[PDB]
């Protein structure tokens, strides 16, 4: 039963990977708070899941701190419960500096999560780099967008990483389901082949290449080149280098009083004029 699992949890059973407490009847805050602490120094559980078990914000606080005090769980499933954003946020801040958890789901709660609670979740997890999948439907375009880009830039760190180690000098690299579809015979309709001959024929219009554009406006080089004019004298005629006098950049009174005076100014000191006209 429960205790058979919990036994193993603090027994550190080298063989219990999943703790599945899904749809388990009559479970307490404390009986889950035990589990939370029962896993507080565990090392053999990668998946802790309590689906559809009247969980609450204490169970969350339980799980939340358990999170910042556990380095082997990659996945937390607190689904179909009765948890508010007061609890959801508990687990959220914990993850502010928790670099192991990789998936968390809180779908299908009691009530609407709210919105301050929703924009919280995004600015909150903003300094998290480890979370890969966040099981929740945001009901707000703003947050939901902010969020998806984050789980993208967390996961690109995986792609960047594999880029450094994986290849770079590593040697090498219960009723009915009403189902009426259609059996097949393949494809007789056609004549989109020619645009593909055309789509091979064209594309990459104008200019685009390179690896990184650290320098300025990697301009397409039609402008730069076609606007010949800027090309000051090259190869032949005058040598125009302006080495001059003997001054330098330590303290200067004339220039820095000038700066002090330039800063202390405003168009409120100038004599009013005007320029509305357009002349024929």
């Amino acid at each position: 039963v429960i205790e058979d699992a919990l036994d193993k949890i603090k027994s550190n059973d080298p063989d219990t990977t999943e703790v599945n407490l899904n749809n388990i009847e009559n479970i307490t805050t404390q009986t889950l708070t035990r589990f939370a602490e029962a896993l507080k120094d565990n090392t053999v559980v990668k998946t802790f899941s309590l689906a559809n078990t009247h969980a609450d914000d204490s169970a969350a606080m339980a799980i939340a701190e358990m999170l910042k005090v556990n380095e082997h769980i990659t996945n937390v499933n607190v689904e179909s419960n009765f948890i508010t954003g007061k609890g959801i946020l508990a687990i959220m801040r914990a993850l502010q500096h928790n670099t192991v958890l990789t998936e968390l789901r809180f779908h299908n709660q009691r009530h609407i999560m709210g919105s301050q609670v929703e924009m919280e979740i995004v600015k909150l997890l903003k300094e998290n780099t480890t979370l890969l999948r966040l099981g929740y439907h945001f009901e707000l375009p703003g947050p939901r967008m902010s969020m998806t880009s984050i789980l993208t830039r967390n996961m690109d760190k995986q792609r960047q990483k594999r880029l450094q180690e994986q290849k770079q000098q590593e040697g090498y690299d219960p009723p009915p389901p009403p189902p009426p579809p259609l059996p097949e015979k393949k494809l007789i309709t056609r004549n989109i082949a020619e645009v593909i001959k055309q789509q091979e024929s064209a594309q990459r219009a104008l200019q685009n290449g390179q690896g990184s554009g650290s320098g300025g406006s990697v301009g397409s080089q039609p402008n730069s080149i076609l606007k010949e004019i800027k090309n000051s004298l090259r190869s032949v005629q005058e040598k125009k280098m302006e080495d001059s006098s003997r001054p330098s950049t330590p303290q200067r009174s004339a220039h820095e009083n000038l700066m002090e005076a330039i800063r202390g100014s405003s168009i409120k000191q100038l004599k009013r004029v005007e320029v509305p006209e357009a002349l024929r």
């Binding site: 689906a51 998806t148 690109d156 579809p181 494809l187 082949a193």
Partner: protein, 369 residues
């Protein structure tokens, strides 16, 4: 090669070069209703597809895709796993995958879709095509305007030699279930009550089996107030038959007159002409003669006929308005892709795992356009 066309409601996936999808199942994920749920689930946390359709009882069904845009990425990953592993019984490592997207999708989403395929499922190669564009290719064309009316939103997408015109894409917030909603509202106003999802699917059926678009509204309105040639009976499951008349066409008149739904937006007929006008004066001619119908809500009888009549009264005198409605425009978005993925010419056009592993998901706006 694989083809996957995701929808705001129904999902169709299958092998490329194929006649039709092998996998067509609802794009839904079910999780327990509430309270002392248990009895129902076993050791599961959710159900997927046509088992989530059969257990609608204690399940609060949700769609990852809303108005054709992925709003739930976790359930989006759930659906995709279900597809390769459960529904299609195939390993996504052994296959390249062509996926689909809505008109005016965010770049952000294009990228997650990209990254999910490459990191999670580990696909050799992948491409992402605008669904409207995939519907034109099935019709055997590369240029034209595609009217796409699905479940949540409507789109008119001008297309020029293989590429959709973003500046000219118009979008309308009326589609499939607004008509189901509407039919429900009037069939109720007239007697029987339709408010529950179980009874809602029969309004979908009253609709699809008995609704049509009139060519001339005010006429068919009066034909019906005059005689009863327009009446048709429908048998409910309990055995009580009901009779609709002017509701057969008052339902899809919403498409042409959104005001019937209290909308200040213009009908699907103007939403198609208006688009053509923000197109180039040198392609309007081939736009008008290549308007193509796509999606399930374009399946009403006489919708092509009404369209022509409307868009000829809007257009200038000299243009021919040809309105093409393929007989299989329910699975056309898939079919148009099934053919694309098979074309020898397309193999160089994929996205390599290498290219991704070097540049990240960002390479998809340039490689796919």
């Amino acid at each position: 090669a694989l083809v996957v066309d995701n929808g705001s409601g129904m999902c169709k996936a299958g092998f490329a070069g194929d006649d039709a999808p092998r996998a067509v199942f609802p794009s839904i994920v079910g999780r327990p209703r509430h309270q002392g749920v248990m009895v129902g689930m076993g050791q599961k946390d959710s159900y997927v597809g046509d088992e989530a359709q059969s257990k609608r009882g204690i399940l609060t069904l949700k769609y990852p895709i809303e108005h054709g845009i992925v709003t739930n990425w976790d359930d989006m990953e759930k659906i995709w796993h279900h597809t390769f592993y459960n529904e299609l019984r195939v390993a996504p490592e052994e296959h390249p995958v062509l996926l689909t997207e809505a008109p005016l999708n965010p770049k952000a989403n294009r990228e997650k879709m990209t990254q999910i395929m490459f990191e999670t499922f580990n696909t050799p190669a992948m491409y992402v095509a605008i669904q409207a564009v995939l519907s034109l290719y099935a019709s055997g064309r590369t240029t034209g305007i595609v009217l796409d009316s699905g479940d949540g939103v409507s789109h008119t997408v001008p297309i020029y030699e293989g590429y959709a015109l973003p500046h000219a894409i118009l979008r309308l917030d009326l589609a499939g279930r607004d008509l189901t909603d509407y039919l429900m509202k009037i069939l109720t106003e007239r007697g029987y009550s339709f408010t529950t999802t179980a009874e809602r699917e029969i309004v979908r059926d009253i609709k699809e089996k008995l609704c049509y678009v009139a060519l001339d509204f005010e006429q068919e309105m009066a034909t019906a107030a005059s005689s009863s040639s327009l009446e048709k009976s429908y048998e409910l499951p309990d055995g009580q038959v009901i009779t609709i008349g002017n509701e057969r066409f008052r339902c899809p008149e919403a498409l042409f007159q959104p005001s019937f739904l209290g909308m200040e937006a213009c009908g699907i007929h103007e939403t198609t002409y208006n688009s053509i006008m923000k197109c180039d004066v040198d392609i309007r001619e081939d736009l008008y003669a290549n308007t193509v119908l796509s999606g399930g809500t374009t399946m009403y009888p006489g919708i092509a006929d009404r369209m022509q009549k409307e868009i000829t009264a809007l257009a200038k005198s000299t243009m021919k308005i040809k309105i093409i409605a393929p007989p299989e425009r329910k699975y056309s978005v898939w079919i148009g892709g099934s053919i694309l993925a098979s074309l020898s010419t397309f193999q160089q056009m994929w996205i390599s795992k290498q290219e991704y592993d070097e540049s990240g998901p960002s390479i998809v706006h340039r490689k796919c356009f």
